[PDB]
Enzyme design. Structure first.
Site, mmCIF file in Angstrom:
data_model
loop_
_atom_site.group_PDB
_atom_site.id
_atom_site.type_symbol
_atom_site.label_atom_id
_atom_site.label_comp_id
_atom_site.label_asym_id
_atom_site.label_seq_id
_atom_site.Cartn_x
_atom_site.Cartn_y
_atom_site.Cartn_z
ATOM 1 N N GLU A 35 0.854 -1.177 0.000
ATOM 2 C CA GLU A 35 0.000 0.000 0.000
ATOM 3 C C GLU A 35 0.908 1.251 0.000
ATOM 4 O O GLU A 35 1.920 1.258 0.686
ATOM 5 C CB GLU A 35 -0.868 -0.028 1.253
ATOM 6 C CG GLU A 35 -1.797 1.158 1.413
ATOM 7 C CD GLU A 35 -2.742 0.929 2.610
ATOM 8 O OE1 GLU A 35 -3.977 0.715 2.397
ATOM 9 O OE2 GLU A 35 -2.190 0.911 3.731
ATOM 10 N N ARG A 110 -4.626 -4.249 0.390
ATOM 11 C CA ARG A 110 -5.911 -3.535 0.291
ATOM 12 C C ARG A 110 -6.241 -3.260 -1.169
ATOM 13 O O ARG A 110 -5.390 -3.498 -2.068
ATOM 14 C CB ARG A 110 -5.912 -2.232 1.092
ATOM 15 C CG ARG A 110 -5.907 -2.413 2.607
ATOM 16 C CD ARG A 110 -6.505 -1.211 3.265
ATOM 17 N NE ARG A 110 -6.515 -1.323 4.728
ATOM 18 C CZ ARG A 110 -5.739 -0.594 5.535
ATOM 19 N NH1 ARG A 110 -4.903 0.294 4.996
ATOM 20 N NH2 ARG A 110 -5.824 -0.726 6.883
HETATM 21 N N1 LIG Z 1 -8.170 4.950 1.658
HETATM 22 C C1 LIG Z 1 -7.545 4.866 2.859
HETATM 23 N N2 LIG Z 1 -7.802 5.794 3.756
HETATM 24 C C2 LIG Z 1 -7.230 5.766 5.023
HETATM 25 O O1 LIG Z 1 -7.453 6.640 5.854
HETATM 26 N N3 LIG Z 1 -6.320 4.774 5.362
HETATM 27 C C3 LIG Z 1 -5.725 4.812 6.728
HETATM 28 C C4 LIG Z 1 -4.738 5.968 6.957
HETATM 29 S S1 LIG Z 1 -3.210 5.300 6.283
HETATM 30 C C5 LIG Z 1 -3.619 3.721 7.069
HETATM 31 C C6 LIG Z 1 -2.835 2.604 6.451
HETATM 32 O O2 LIG Z 1 -3.195 1.332 6.930
HETATM 33 O O3 LIG Z 1 -5.056 3.597 6.958
HETATM 34 C C7 LIG Z 1 -6.022 3.785 4.459
HETATM 35 C C8 LIG Z 1 -6.601 3.823 3.234
HETATM 36 F F1 LIG Z 1 -6.297 2.860 2.326
#
Ligand SMILES: Nc1nc(=O)n([C@@H]2CS[C@H](CO)O2)cc1F
Ligand SMILES: Nc1ncnc2c1ncn2[C@@H]1O[C@H](COP(=O)(O)OP(=O)(O)O)[C@@H](O)[C@H]1O
Ligand SMILES: Nc1ncnc2c1ncn2[C@@H]1O[C@H](COP(=O)(O)OP(=O)(O)O)[C@@H](O)[C@H]1O
Ligand SMILES: Nc1nc(=O)n([C@@H]2CS[C@H](CO)O2)cc1F
Lengths: 242, 222
Positions: A35, A110
């Site tokens: 990610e 994800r």
């Molecule tokens: N679209 C997303 N929005 C988020 O706030 N996050 C949050 C903030 S970064 C953290 C990483 O696991 O999760 C992740 C995503 F993929």
């Protein structure tokens, strides 16, 4: 294409990057698209071809931190960027890795679906995006997805299920700076979105094939050594079914 | 194989008028209008108005949606309505004026911060690089900022009625730097090759003979 695409889903600090990065050593035909969280905490764009020979690529803004600090101002901007950078990374890896593989499996940390139906949606429900922002975001998300067709479509989902309290503890263990003020309630709301989508499967999305995509749910609340053998066995069994 | 020509120029220079006229000269000519109706009714919210009223808050959201909505309309029009001898599609503005004129100006005035501007460039770089829209030519409709200010009032779009002369001067200097002086650099290298026909549209529409003929035949050179 021939590449099977498997998304690894779960709350912040569930242990997705840890689990998947150890798992994928099991096969040369297995790779991971991580990610792009580094790109959200240090926001940078491409340098001109001549400028980069004499100028450093400096540290840019921290849009992750901005979102946590003032979500009603930054949520839309953050979510737009998070999804764009994800799609960009997943596409490039689709078109460039696992070319010489017998049974290639690309694991996504994800998906574009969790961007929208978990993260953005939770922010809309929290009034951190207003109706206009939410409408723009969904419109853009739909459009990009229709553009790609079956490109990014998932073959399977592995849900790593951890309690909000486990995730909170693991946030502390990992020590990512911007996450340190995250309260239990926020993780809990996110938890509930994951359960509705991946476990109870009551959450409805604009992407019909998802209603049928197979899901493996793994309990990752235990210390890593304590269940890893069994999780690896479950994953291998699941993949043989796709 | 469709020729793509963008019509560029300041707010209310008269692009929509001119191209709607030009459209009728040939069955082979179609127009992609700037999606300004979509911007004042988001489908809803008036994000155009939100941007004019609170530009430090809404400029980035507006710019992103404006460019997205334009790309969408332009792609859709290529995707079938011109099976034609010599097809021309006239775009009302381009993704280049979205970034290099409007968004850049908002950044320059501090309505976008460094992070917002970096995100916008990064999104614009990727978005463009997938999505075919490359221009064969550009028509620049040159009107003074005082002309544009008058024509804003003539047209009476509600969201536009408070626009000051100075803001139009800023947009005018940008256009001039891009399309006349050619001192404005983009990271789109092919754009240095695209011919530009500059047409002076300051007079009341009764030079329109000269201008149509000049287009009609700028096109025959492409
Ligand atoms: N679209 C997303 N929005 C988020 O706030 N996050 C949050 C903030 S970064 C953290 C990483 O696991 O999760 C992740 C995503 F993929
Ligand atoms: N099963 C586990 N037992 C103990 N620590 C774990 C376990 N899984 C992950 N961790 C630790 O939890 C933290 C977050 O894990 P990480 O894989 O980075 O989460 P994610 O990628 O899901 O956000 C890290 O410090 C990691 O070492
Ligand atoms: N050459 C012209 N002479 C007199 N009125 C003009 C002329 N060009 C445009 N107009 C009027 O000025 C207004 C702005 O024109 P419009 O085509 O909507 O501008 P744009 O599409 O460039 O924003 C409209 O009311 C239009 O009828
Ligand atoms: N990208 C754009 N940003 C703008 O503010 N505008 C302004 C605001 S709407 C008006 C239409 O002429 O121009 C136009 C664009 F194309």
């Amino acid at each position: 294409t021939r590449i099977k695409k498997i998304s690894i889903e779960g709350n912040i600090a569930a242990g997705k990057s840890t689990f998947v990065n150890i798992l994928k050593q099991l096969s040369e035909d297995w790779e991971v698209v991580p990610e792009p969280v580094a790109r959200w905490s240090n926001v940078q764009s491409t340098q001109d071809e001549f400028e980069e020979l004499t100028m450093s690529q400096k540290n840019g803004g921290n849009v992750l931190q901005m979102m946590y600090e003032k979500p009603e101002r930054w949520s839309f901007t953050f979510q737009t960027y998070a999804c764009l950078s994800r799609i960009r990374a997943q596409l490039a890896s689709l078109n460039g890795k696992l070319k010489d593989a017998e049974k290639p499996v690309l694991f996504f940390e994800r998906s574009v679906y969790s961007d929208r139906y978990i993260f953005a949606s939770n922010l809309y429900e929290s009034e951190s995006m207003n109706e206009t922002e939410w409408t723009i975001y969904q419109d853009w998300h739909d459009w990009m997805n229709n553009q790609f067709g079956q490109s990014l479509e998932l073959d399977g989902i592995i849900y790593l299920q951890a309690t909000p309290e486990t995730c909170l503890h693991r946030i502390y263990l990992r020590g990512r700076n911007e996450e340190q003020g995250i309260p239990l309630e926020y993780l809990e709301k996110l938890h509930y979105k994951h359960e509705s989508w991946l476990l109870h499967r009551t959450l409805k999305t604009n992407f019909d094939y998802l209603q049928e995509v197979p899901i493996l749910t793994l309990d990752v609340n235990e210390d890593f050594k304590d269940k890893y053998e069994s999780l690896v066995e479950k994953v291998k069994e699941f993949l043989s079914t796709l």
